[PDB]
Amino acid sequence: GTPPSTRFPGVAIYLVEPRMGRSRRAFLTGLARSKGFRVLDACSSEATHVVMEETSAEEAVSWQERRMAAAPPGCTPPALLDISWLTESLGAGQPVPVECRHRLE
User: Fold this and answer.
1) Is 44 in contact with 89 (CB distance < 8 Å)?
2) CATH code of 74's domain
3) HSE, side-chain direction, 13 A CA sphere, residue 82
4) Cβ neighbours of residue 80 closer than 8 Å, sequence gap 6 or more
5) Nearest to residue 56, comparing CAs of 82, 78, 79, 77?
6) Range of the domain at 77
7) Around Cβ 97, how many Cβ atoms within 10 Å?
8) Count of C-beta atoms within a 10 Å radius of residue 82
9) Helix (H) or strand (E) holding 34
């Protein structure tokens, strides 16, 4: 039953489960899917938007290093930022232009 509920490709969004409340995850999941955002899951570099909950700058940066460590050396790293990007993106119903603000990496 629509296992890959991504709806609109192109905008791959990878969520950091180890640092993301399941309550908020399922909340942004069902929504982003109905809004027009691709929910990138599993260890895939195809992601272009790394959003995480309760994460500081170096906190997400360290995670980025962990992600690249799992990916083949040469793969372009996705957009490391905060979950605040997705929330607002859901409000407007479209992938809003990420600013340096949300990209506090």
Assistant:
1) no
2) 3.40.50.10190
3) 16
4) 50, 60, 61, 63, 64, 103, 105
5) 82
6) 1-105
7) 8
8) 22
9) helix 22-35
